[PDB]
Amino acid sequence: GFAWWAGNARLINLSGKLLGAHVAHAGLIVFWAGAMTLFELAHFIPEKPMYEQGLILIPHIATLGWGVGPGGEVVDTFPFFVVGVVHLISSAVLGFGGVYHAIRGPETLEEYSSFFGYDWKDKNKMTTILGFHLIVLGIGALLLVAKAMFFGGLYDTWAPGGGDVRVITNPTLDPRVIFGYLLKSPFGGEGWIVSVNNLEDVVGGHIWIGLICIAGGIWHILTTPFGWARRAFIWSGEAYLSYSLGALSMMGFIATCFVWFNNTVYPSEFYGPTGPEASQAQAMTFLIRDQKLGANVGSAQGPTGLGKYLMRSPTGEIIFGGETMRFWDFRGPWLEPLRGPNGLDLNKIKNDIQPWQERRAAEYMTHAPLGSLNSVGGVATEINSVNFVSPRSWLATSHFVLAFFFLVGHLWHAGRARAAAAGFEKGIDRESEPVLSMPSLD
Amino acid sequence: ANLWERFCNWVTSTDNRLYVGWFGVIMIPTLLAATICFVIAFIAAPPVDIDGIREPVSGSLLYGNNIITGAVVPSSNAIGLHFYPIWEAASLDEWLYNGGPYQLIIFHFLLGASCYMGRQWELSYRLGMRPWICVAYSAPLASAFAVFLIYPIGQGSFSDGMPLGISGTFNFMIVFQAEHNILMHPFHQLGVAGVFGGALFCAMHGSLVTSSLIRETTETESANYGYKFGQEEETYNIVAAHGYFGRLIFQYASFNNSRSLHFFLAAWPVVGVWFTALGISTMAFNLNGFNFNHSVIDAKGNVINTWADIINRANLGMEVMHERNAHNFPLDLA
Amino acid sequence: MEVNQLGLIATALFVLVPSVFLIILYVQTESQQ
């Protein structure tokens, strides 16, 4: 009963054609992974930092240990070529299966095989497909652990000496650490799971989620939903879609914040400095410059009566002054050598700032993630000259927009699933209008 | 007849004058808390150090404000995005100085407004309606999330979220224009198109229907009395209305299907406002409006100014003046 | 604050005069039916 513009809704009860669609669409996703990487590589120039260059896939690969060495210098591009090629080739295989099932394969599956066929209302069969996919996903997460622990390691921005690839040999297994991130507040200085700041915790969380995903995959193949679950949910394909839209939406918002604040699994060598990072870096830059001129940066009272360079945070910690007072929860490898127990240590500041830290602060300050939509770098009043928009702004904004629309999609399909399930998604029955049988409000 | 089933039946009752429902169990308290704190703060809160420079800003009527200038002032830049409930202050005196009420209000209000949208789904379900009115309300709600939460997240501080005030609203939008050149951002442009067009189409539809009401009354009575609540016949003549409007433009630029027309009425403003909410939400991450500053130069390399350069001059005057004691370093990076 | 002292009678009559006119018209409507 659907129009051309709701045309895919026609696939709801056509399990074989619907497989074609899902598998063809997986191939577009693999295709783009493939092609974008080859494009990024064809344009890549290693003398330049990645973040001056529009790259978002190559930095994900570099972060996994491939192609980089100490400090993020790109050593060997061939891993990049391989990842794109293999993805690219693999998308033709997915394309083939895809269009075969959508055009020529059996239109529905349930007659050709009781195993692959499904009815959306088969609570047992639905949980079994879910359980298989959980197991797959658990395997997925272990592959990251395997890379970190047995096949080369991962890029560690925090590695002493500028950052480097490092094998992870003591992943954090302590559930108080792993699940304790899940209980930190999402607010400032806490940051929920976005605060994860070392690879030991990253890798141990993936062990946990790998096992938990396999456990739960196994659980769901062996069980059927209990009765409270049966009475809480709608059991239909569109309702299941709506659940996943909700989850993808939530996940997109999390990713937005991840790429904006986290400089551990989004190393700044590759993605550029975070907003907080760049702001901190400017205060460092002018503290350094001014101290070299003779300023005593700890005793310099600024115009407001607050320190020009250094002040206290609301809980006492010595921090950079000016507007970047908002950004003192920032931590990064170039700045932590200056932290004592009370925050920025004034004697280290006077004595132990290194040339490499001066360079890094200047670089991050001048690559703050501010830019125009036509890629003019810098504040919105800046002139044309620098062609730059941070990967972090591109990745934050894009995924906030997709997260937003997927929440809208969740509401659309959740509401519609509820109404179809009850029988009024097409309108009010003129002869049985519920309101006309209720008492009036007054 | 079980005690919990009785409560559940009162919660979801369609016979309550205002529907409660499960979303409302959360909405009533959180909206009451936000509203009460706001009324009291707007009237009597003392000055708040919004930018963390010990430069307190007076926002309440009792400290010298009027209706237009009053505001509940954003919480201090010194707090950033840290959570500042009452119980984290040494005293209420401290909490007031640092802008705590703003945080209380906006978090309760956002929760309560989110539950408002859910409540709209919920009663639609109990009444046998279609579900998507709440989707229309997601446009305004996303817009409130943008200026109260998303933009503060991206910039690092609730001190840069929109003030709860008429003149503070204006401050916000001026400083947004200098830091983001929002006017030159196509998503703001689409929001203007959603909002101008929505008003246009509001007027169009109301005048076309009003133009084609069927004579049911005399000259000496409001024509409104020609429609009686719950009559089954339409009260206007859409074929007459289609015949006028299609001749005003041409035939196929006029709707003759009421369902398409009202859907269009719904779609146009909702979607332009989605985009403008998305505009604020992405400028939260500094993907700013188009920059054509010095884009035209002559054969020698002289700049030839365009109206974008003139805009830039204005933007500069906003940039150099705002928060005039708060910057120590040359770039206002957040 | 050093406000215009007539702002108060300006405001009072601005509310009062049009409001009273509506109230008059409504009460005499109700006692027609």
Binding site: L441, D442 | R17, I43, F229, G230 | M1, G7, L8, V15
Partner: peptide, 30 residues
């Protein structure tokens, strides 16, 4: 005096809200 005026007018609107909701002309089918 100006503070009192503002809050008075605000108060009057809230009271109007209450009467318009709970003491409205009830809509009656036909």
């Amino acid at each position: 005096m100006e503070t009192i005026t503002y809050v008075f007018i605000f108060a009057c609107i809230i009271a109007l809200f209450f009467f318009a909701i709970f003491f409205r002309e009830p809509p009656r089918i036909t």
